[PDB]
Amino acid sequence: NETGRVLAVGDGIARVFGLNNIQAEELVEFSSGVKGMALNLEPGQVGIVLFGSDRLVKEGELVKRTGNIVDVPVGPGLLGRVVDALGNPIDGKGPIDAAGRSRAQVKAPGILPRRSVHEPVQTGLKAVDALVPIGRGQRELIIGDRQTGKTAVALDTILNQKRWNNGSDESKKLYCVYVAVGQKRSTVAQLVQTLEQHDAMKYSIIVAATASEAAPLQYLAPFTAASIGEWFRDNGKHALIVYDDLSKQAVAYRQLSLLLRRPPGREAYPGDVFYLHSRLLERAAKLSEKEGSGSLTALPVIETQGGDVSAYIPTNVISITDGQIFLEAELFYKGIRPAINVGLSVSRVGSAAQVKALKQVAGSLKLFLAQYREVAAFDASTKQTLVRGERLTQLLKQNQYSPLATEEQVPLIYAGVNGHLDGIELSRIGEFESSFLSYLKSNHNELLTEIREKGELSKELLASLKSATESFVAT
Amino acid sequence: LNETGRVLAVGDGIARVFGLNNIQAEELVEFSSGVKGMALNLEPGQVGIVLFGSDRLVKEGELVKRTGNIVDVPVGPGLLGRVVDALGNPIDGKGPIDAAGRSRAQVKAPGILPRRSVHEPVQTGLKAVDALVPIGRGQRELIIGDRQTGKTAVALDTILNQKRWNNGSDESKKLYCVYVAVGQKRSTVAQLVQTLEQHDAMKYSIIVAATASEAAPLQYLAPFTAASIGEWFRDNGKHALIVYDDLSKQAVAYRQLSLLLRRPPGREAYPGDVFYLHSRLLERAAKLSEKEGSGSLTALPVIETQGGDVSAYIPTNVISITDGQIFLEAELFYKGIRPAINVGLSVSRVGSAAQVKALKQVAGSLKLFLAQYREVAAFAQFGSDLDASTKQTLVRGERLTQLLKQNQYSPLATEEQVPLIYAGVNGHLDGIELSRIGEFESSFLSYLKSNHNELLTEIREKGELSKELLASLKSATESFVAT
Amino acid sequence: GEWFRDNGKHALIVYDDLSKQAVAYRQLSLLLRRPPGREAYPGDVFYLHSRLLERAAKLSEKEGSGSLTALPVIETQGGDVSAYIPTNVISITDGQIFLEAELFYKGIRPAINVGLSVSRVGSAAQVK
Amino acid sequence: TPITGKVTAVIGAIVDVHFEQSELPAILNALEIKTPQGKLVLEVAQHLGENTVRTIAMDGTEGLVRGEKVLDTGGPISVPVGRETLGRIINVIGEPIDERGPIKSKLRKPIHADPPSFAEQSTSAEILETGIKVVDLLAPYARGGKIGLFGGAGVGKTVFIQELINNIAKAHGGFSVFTGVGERTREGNDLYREMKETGVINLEGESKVALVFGQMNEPPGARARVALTGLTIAEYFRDEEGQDVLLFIDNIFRFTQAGSEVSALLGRIPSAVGYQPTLATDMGLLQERITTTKKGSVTSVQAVYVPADDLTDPAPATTFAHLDATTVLSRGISELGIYPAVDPLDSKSRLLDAAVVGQEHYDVASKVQETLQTYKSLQDIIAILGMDELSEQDKLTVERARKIQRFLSQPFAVAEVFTGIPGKLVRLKDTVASFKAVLEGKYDNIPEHAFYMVGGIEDVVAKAEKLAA
Amino acid sequence: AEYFRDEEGQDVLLFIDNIFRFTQAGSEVSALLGRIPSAVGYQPTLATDMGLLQERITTTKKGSVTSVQAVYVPADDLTDPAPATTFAHLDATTVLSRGISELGIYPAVDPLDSKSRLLD
Amino acid sequence: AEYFRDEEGQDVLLFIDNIFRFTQAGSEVSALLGRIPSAVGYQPTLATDMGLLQERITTTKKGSVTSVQAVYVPADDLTDPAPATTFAHLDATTVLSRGISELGIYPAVDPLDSKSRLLD
Amino acid sequence: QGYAAEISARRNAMDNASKNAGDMINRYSILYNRTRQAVITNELVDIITGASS
Ligand SMILES: Nc1ncnc2c1ncn2[C@@H]1O[C@H](COP(=O)(O)OP(=O)(O)OP(=O)(O)O)[C@@H](O)[C@H]1O
Ligand SMILES: Nc1ncnc2c1ncn2[C@@H]1O[C@H](COP(=O)(O)OP(=O)(O)OP(=O)(O)O)[C@@H](O)[C@H]1O
Ligand SMILES: Nc1ncnc2c1ncn2[C@@H]1O[C@H](COP(=O)(O)OP(=O)(O)OP(=O)(O)O)[C@@H](O)[C@H]1O
Ligand SMILES: [Mg+2]
Ligand SMILES: [Mg+2]
Ligand SMILES: [Mg+2]
């Protein structure tokens, strides 16, 4: 009664007779040690999706029931090691420790428990920090094309937390989870090497449902990673999760659905796809002090084709997130990196959670840069307006793996906005920036402590920084 | 066993029923819970029955009983001024329907021999259609176009224009009207009936209102029953104009029925017999022989199209079936050409034979002038100092297209259109600044109505021009052009 | 043709026109209710054309000198070289003689487009 | 006793139930399955035969086991109605989620009802002033009418509806209903947060709006019926209370989208591009309910998401027919920085007719559209060959159209953080005067820059003066 | 027509309007019989049925049949399978263009579009 | 190639000409198996087929198998699922051109259209 | 002087015109390719749906 016998298997799908007591989506385990999810019940049979490869099962095999719905181990025991879906350790460092186990598919928190975002996800990228701030608990899409630096935007953000996760208290901490879907395993290896060369691996988790895994593992992995992050959320510690990238998740779900012979929808994607992403991404939130206090924050990645943000999957995902960053390929190969297309890049809540000093100095810089774009497409003052824009577009650039603390961003943005850089040679700007911070580190440093600790410039410090910027310009 | 059945399955307004060994195809049946339905699938072991109502009160194991009589509708003059559902039941609440008789929905269209060719007009009062795209009695003319481009307004103007003759005693010139709203929202029907009543057209209009709240089959039947209504006029020896708004909304309902019936899908997931369907509907338009009273039924099907692409299955079928097309475009609607008719694409196969004869000579080469204008309209943007001849064509063509502007719900008798087209063709308005053209059109008629009444009166009464009448109109236009 | 090829004669074959052959193959496939494919051709039409076309050959003197040469003929709707069946054939063939409606109208007869037509192998065999 | 069945099949949101006795649940009846996570509610959708019924489940169907007992409620899904629903957040199947205690009222009503009889239909031409320049100018709204906002992902629909709320609802005197359907959960929470801060809701006191929500995280079964739940709330105010109802539904596309999600599992042959066979009539049974009867007004605003920005898609194509006015938002305008991104050509309205809006207003709007269409016709030549070649009057028309286009922009209060510019409302007569004056050619001497985002011509001249300084 | 050809030996001039709707009716019947739709919905048998109809029209030793056929061309696309199939079966083709009639030229034969194998 | 890598130890180059027709063969196989075609006709298993083929060629203890893969591009468009799927894995790309050879540059590598993710 | 200036200005202006013409050629090539894939998928799904019952 408890255990069924296989009737058919193929394409990663199986049908099993028996299993009369199985819960929907319960984990079966086959005679060969592969595991599957009971996806499609019917009278007299259970249709099952294999997480492992199709070769691992035969007709006539006898199938066990796990007794639990799809679930993952959770807690800090996972911290600092690589895991495949279903919580399998693959770092070769030994078994996973766990605080508990949680279903992969818990419902996202309802309307009442949530709180509007009011804390910043410290980027480390100047353009992201000033123009499209990201608040803890917000969902911000990163969208782009091949080799246009989509991974870098998230990787700099993950590294930047180094300065706080080592801090004295849990208040500012931000734990990190990175999810690779359908990627080259070599890419995951090298990325883990990058995160271990830096200190980041001491506080981050990697989920690595790479290209060789059968479709259901790629389909399931994001939910499992989210279920890991939700433990941190619900225990009152902030968590950031990244997905490179959800388009390959959509492709995996398309393959899995079509092999189930469900109707192909628009653009050959199954009509259910909207649900797939949404019930994932809604699980990021910030919970009000009434039920703990913490956030799960999400950075999904989408690989466009030819910049077509209007394609089905891009628009579908954009309908769910609270913002978007569109990395223009033309700007990347123009040499303007990280190539944020400021016109289309949007943060729907971050302006209410940006660290106050940076907003204070930025002073509507977003519309100013959109105006610079409008000018650059082609009166003497209209021509002059382009010069400071050129300075700013030179200054926003940043190299990989080298974040700036807010105390460093604020002086530079201030100098750019006030125009004190307009007189400087455009080509020397990269020399200026690295130099100006050095000057701040040597002489004005107390001002750097004030800007960093207080969170706002006082009027006295506004005038003081004007004087300091003009002095360094005089140098 | 044979005269009754039991419901095997129910869903989406379609039921699979056991028994009914004597049932005729398309026969109407009754469910004991009070719902009525129509048989469309016959298989060795079951009958597929689509429902004329909600299935919320049908259940497995319901008894189903035959009725023998196929779908039919009441017909007669009492339907005038009333709004009726797809099966002819009153819905306006004004009272019962004074039916003269009944007729089955599906009916053979008139054969080859009883017919005679079109030789009488249906004066729309829509200046551009009468001048350029004639519509005759017994003709079937498609109105096809994009989302919200005045497709309904064109037909409504055509309907309203008949008030002139319908109020007289000229029985032979009358034209009753039937408007079939299908897939429209119900408040749209309410607004349309109010609009007709405000203009007193309701006296001679019949309205079928199978709006989108109705279960799908009622939309399917809604045109055919309307046709059976109109034919009662035709067979009785009178003239009726049937408008379908719109047959694509109906094709969607038939697609739903066919897919739920599990008939094999065709192109674009439509059933394979769509062309047969619209043929059975539209071939009933005809003008009968003098043997049978020379009455007629005239059809104006309406087809909405997405992005203007006629390549879709339903628009292509209906374009094939009909005698002519009126193409409406958003481009023309926005840049100021209202009713926004694309002249180039709007062929009509009856053509000059349909127009009231006076307008034939007056319009004359109007088609040639507009068609030549369209050729150079794009070239004009080159900025070249084009020759005086092409410049003459370019200066007039736009100024003449301007004369085909018209206000909504304001149809003009041909008595009025003849002076306008005459002036536009003979170029007597060539020197007028463009913005004043709309003034001129307004003022010119008034002038003729004030000072030349005996000429307009002849343009009606004679229905034809002569050298002397043309010369007199020339005198009036030459005088008027100098203010 | 292969009887002449293998027996050491020299043979040429002309296929007017393989597009209709593919159409007949799809008719059989669809009436057999086999899986359809792109452009409603059966998924393995590429195999249909390759199985035939690869029979063109020149045998070695050790095998017995002989040759079969092939001239596939295709009808190109609107000049769309990228159409499915022409695409497969071009992927299989060694080169194209490419006629054009435009050039035939212009009176260039036999109307070969010199720019699009190429002969990869034949340049080694044109008369010395 | 109540009548019991057993589950036999579970697939996603669909469950098949077998009844041993010949007693059978009517279609659309509500079935309850007891589970430790709280009762699961299912809706009967089909009869398959041999006493088997196919139903849609409204929570996650995980944890269900074949053979589980299923209990018939003896009627369709129902929700509480009446004034007591005001100031509350209501789940699709009637339970509150605002954690302010059980809602109790004299009456519930079922989810499903026939739309209003034709004999009770009502019409009126009372133009409704929104305070939005482009809307009031080119596509006015109507009291008691149905209006729809169409747009691709992220073009401004929700911000637009919130601006409409801030302009309209403040002291409407009637009662309002807001229905969230597949929208962001953040959107619902933020709406509730802002409303408690502006007096529309009062935990202590009285309130003017009822909130019904099923957001994008919920399974498709609930996303389908949640719209009908909000509609059932609205209808009671219409027909029993007799007060004009402000109905807001966002996002309504998710309705038919939800249907598609179930369509495959119910076993329908899919329609074109994967939509339901029942698309038309399944839309209708919802949409027809919303019209205003002789008994009382329902003024309704519907948010229409467009997948892939493709208006030829069956969903919006079927949706346009059911509305009296439609404002179309397009991505191209947003990319050019113009907000609130209303397409001034495709936006259309029943009321734009000389008889109801005023002759001067109608003439001004016609000429404005003519100018914009001229620019949109020239833009290809302008792009390729260049603006220099334009004919003198055509060049003037282009320079005028560009001013008008950028003049149709407007900063809403709800976008105050986005733009950094205070939100501003405009009187309608002011809008007519402004665009008339611009088409008289008064202001071609003004730099185009001045027209961008100010509420009215006087503000344009003031900004020009400030710019010149 | 074939009775007059074979038995009477008389030459016959045969007119058909419209063969495109023959193909369309073939599509309808094939779909209704439940065969799988071919490219853009036309019946799989399109080539074989069109051939079966057209080859009967051929001339034999005992008397000729000369035939004039009209095709409706959907959306003016001569490359659509229904009209395109017929090019394999015609000695001469005469493309009419409404654009020529717009220029006031009748019967509006597109002079560059027509083809005739006997122009030799 | 793998046996040379793991059991011998030396590095290896595996030349695959042409990967597009591996994709084509995969599509034919999946169509024949009755797996309903996916976008623009390619088979559902395109992604995991390419993964199973290319995931194996990587560095290990003994050495590595590097692979030059010739890429045909349908319709010369880099967004089509076949080349788009392939490019998800490629490390670097070399572009040859007839024009470069004609200019007298041998071997005729384009120095700018060639791109390498290892230029780091 | 005016003749020479006109000729030079014409040369420059139409070189720029060719620039923008090429830009549109690129964008329309991309849009054509997208429509190609979309059309192929849309047409194929009709065959699949017909065959799948
Ligand atoms: N800040 C930067 N400045 C300059 N170059 C950068 C920067 N960040 C990344 N790059 C370039 O991009 C490479 C990494 O690209 P990345 O992996 O982020 O792109 P991607 O869009 O995620 O690609 P894929 O689709 O392959 O995952 C770096 O090796 C370097 O070549
Ligand atoms: N002659 C005209 N002059 C000005 N405006 C007009 C004219 N005719 C119609 N309109 C306006 O154009 C629109 C036409 O609406 P109508 O309902 O006729 O459209 P339709 O194309 O039939 O749409 P649908 O497919 O939604 O039924 C309305 O705004 C109407 O006011
Ligand atoms: N008038 C406006 N002024 C300023 N910003 C605007 C305006 N309209 C839209 N936006 C910007 O565009 C986005 C609008 O957000 P909103 O939630 O309204 O989007 P939406 O179109 O409803 O999205 P979705 O398709 O996901 O439902 C935000 O970035 C907002 O800043
Ligand atoms: Mg990446
Ligand atoms: Mg209409
Ligand atoms: Mg929204």
JSON list of C-alpha atoms in Angstrom, two decimals, chain A residues 271-325:
[
{"chain": "A", "resi": 271, "resn": "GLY", "atom": "CA", "xyz": [0.73, 30.20, -19.64]},
{"chain": "A", "resi": 272, "resn": "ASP", "atom": "CA", "xyz": [1.55, 29.37, -16.01]},
{"chain": "A", "resi": 273, "resn": "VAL", "atom": "CA", "xyz": [4.93, 31.12, -16.23]},
{"chain": "A", "resi": 274, "resn": "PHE", "atom": "CA", "xyz": [3.60, 34.37, -14.74]},
{"chain": "A", "resi": 275, "resn": "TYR", "atom": "CA", "xyz": [2.73, 32.47, -11.58]},
{"chain": "A", "resi": 276, "resn": "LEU", "atom": "CA", "xyz": [6.13, 30.74, -11.43]},
{"chain": "A", "resi": 277, "resn": "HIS", "atom": "CA", "xyz": [8.12, 33.94, -11.02]},
{"chain": "A", "resi": 278, "resn": "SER", "atom": "CA", "xyz": [5.54, 35.86, -9.03]},
{"chain": "A", "resi": 279, "resn": "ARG", "atom": "CA", "xyz": [5.04, 33.40, -6.18]},
{"chain": "A", "resi": 280, "resn": "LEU", "atom": "CA", "xyz": [8.83, 33.39, -5.95]},
{"chain": "A", "resi": 281, "resn": "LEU", "atom": "CA", "xyz": [9.48, 37.11, -5.97]},
{"chain": "A", "resi": 282, "resn": "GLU", "atom": "CA", "xyz": [6.61, 38.06, -3.65]},
{"chain": "A", "resi": 283, "resn": "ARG", "atom": "CA", "xyz": [8.40, 36.17, -0.87]},
{"chain": "A", "resi": 284, "resn": "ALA", "atom": "CA", "xyz": [10.88, 39.04, -0.54]},
{"chain": "A", "resi": 285, "resn": "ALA", "atom": "CA", "xyz": [9.49, 41.60, 1.92]},
{"chain": "A", "resi": 286, "resn": "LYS", "atom": "CA", "xyz": [10.22, 43.58, 5.05]},
{"chain": "A", "resi": 287, "resn": "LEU", "atom": "CA", "xyz": [8.20, 42.55, 8.09]},
{"chain": "A", "resi": 288, "resn": "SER", "atom": "CA", "xyz": [6.89, 45.12, 10.55]},
{"chain": "A", "resi": 289, "resn": "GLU", "atom": "CA", "xyz": [8.05, 45.07, 14.16]},
{"chain": "A", "resi": 290, "resn": "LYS", "atom": "CA", "xyz": [4.79, 43.28, 15.05]},
{"chain": "A", "resi": 291, "resn": "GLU", "atom": "CA", "xyz": [6.18, 39.96, 13.71]},
{"chain": "A", "resi": 292, "resn": "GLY", "atom": "CA", "xyz": [9.91, 40.04, 14.22]},
{"chain": "A", "resi": 293, "resn": "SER", "atom": "CA", "xyz": [11.79, 42.63, 12.20]},
{"chain": "A", "resi": 294, "resn": "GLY", "atom": "CA", "xyz": [13.80, 41.88, 9.08]},
{"chain": "A", "resi": 295, "resn": "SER", "atom": "CA", "xyz": [13.78, 41.66, 5.33]},
{"chain": "A", "resi": 296, "resn": "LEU", "atom": "CA", "xyz": [14.35, 39.37, 2.39]},
{"chain": "A", "resi": 297, "resn": "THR", "atom": "CA", "xyz": [15.53, 41.40, -0.61]},
{"chain": "A", "resi": 298, "resn": "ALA", "atom": "CA", "xyz": [15.88, 40.16, -4.18]},
{"chain": "A", "resi": 299, "resn": "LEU", "atom": "CA", "xyz": [18.04, 40.92, -7.23]},
{"chain": "A", "resi": 300, "resn": "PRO", "atom": "CA", "xyz": [16.79, 38.75, -10.10]},
{"chain": "A", "resi": 301, "resn": "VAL", "atom": "CA", "xyz": [18.72, 38.86, -13.37]},
{"chain": "A", "resi": 302, "resn": "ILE", "atom": "CA", "xyz": [17.20, 38.67, -16.86]},
{"chain": "A", "resi": 303, "resn": "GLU", "atom": "CA", "xyz": [19.16, 38.17, -20.09]},
{"chain": "A", "resi": 304, "resn": "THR", "atom": "CA", "xyz": [17.47, 40.18, -22.83]},
{"chain": "A", "resi": 305, "resn": "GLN", "atom": "CA", "xyz": [18.09, 39.74, -26.55]},
{"chain": "A", "resi": 306, "resn": "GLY", "atom": "CA", "xyz": [19.07, 42.82, -28.53]},
{"chain": "A", "resi": 307, "resn": "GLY", "atom": "CA", "xyz": [17.84, 45.06, -25.73]},
{"chain": "A", "resi": 308, "resn": "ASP", "atom": "CA", "xyz": [14.22, 43.96, -26.32]},
{"chain": "A", "resi": 309, "resn": "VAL", "atom": "CA", "xyz": [12.74, 44.82, -22.94]},
{"chain": "A", "resi": 310, "resn": "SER", "atom": "CA", "xyz": [9.35, 44.39, -24.63]},
{"chain": "A", "resi": 311, "resn": "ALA", "atom": "CA", "xyz": [9.73, 40.62, -25.04]},
{"chain": "A", "resi": 312, "resn": "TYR", "atom": "CA", "xyz": [7.30, 38.41, -23.15]},
{"chain": "A", "resi": 313, "resn": "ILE", "atom": "CA", "xyz": [9.47, 37.30, -20.22]},
{"chain": "A", "resi": 314, "resn": "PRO", "atom": "CA", "xyz": [11.13, 40.70, -19.62]},
{"chain": "A", "resi": 315, "resn": "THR", "atom": "CA", "xyz": [7.82, 42.55, -19.41]},
{"chain": "A", "resi": 316, "resn": "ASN", "atom": "CA", "xyz": [6.25, 39.73, -17.40]},
{"chain": "A", "resi": 317, "resn": "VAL", "atom": "CA", "xyz": [9.00, 39.93, -14.78]},
{"chain": "A", "resi": 318, "resn": "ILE", "atom": "CA", "xyz": [9.02, 43.74, -14.82]},
{"chain": "A", "resi": 319, "resn": "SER", "atom": "CA", "xyz": [5.34, 43.56, -13.88]},
{"chain": "A", "resi": 320, "resn": "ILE", "atom": "CA", "xyz": [6.37, 41.99, -10.55]},
{"chain": "A", "resi": 321, "resn": "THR", "atom": "CA", "xyz": [9.47, 43.86, -9.37]},
{"chain": "A", "resi": 322, "resn": "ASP", "atom": "CA", "xyz": [9.53, 47.25, -7.63]},
{"chain": "A", "resi": 323, "resn": "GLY", "atom": "CA", "xyz": [12.20, 48.59, -9.99]},
{"chain": "A", "resi": 324, "resn": "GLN", "atom": "CA", "xyz": [14.61, 47.84, -12.78]},
{"chain": "A", "resi": 325, "resn": "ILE", "atom": "CA", "xyz": [18.16, 48.57, -13.93]}
]
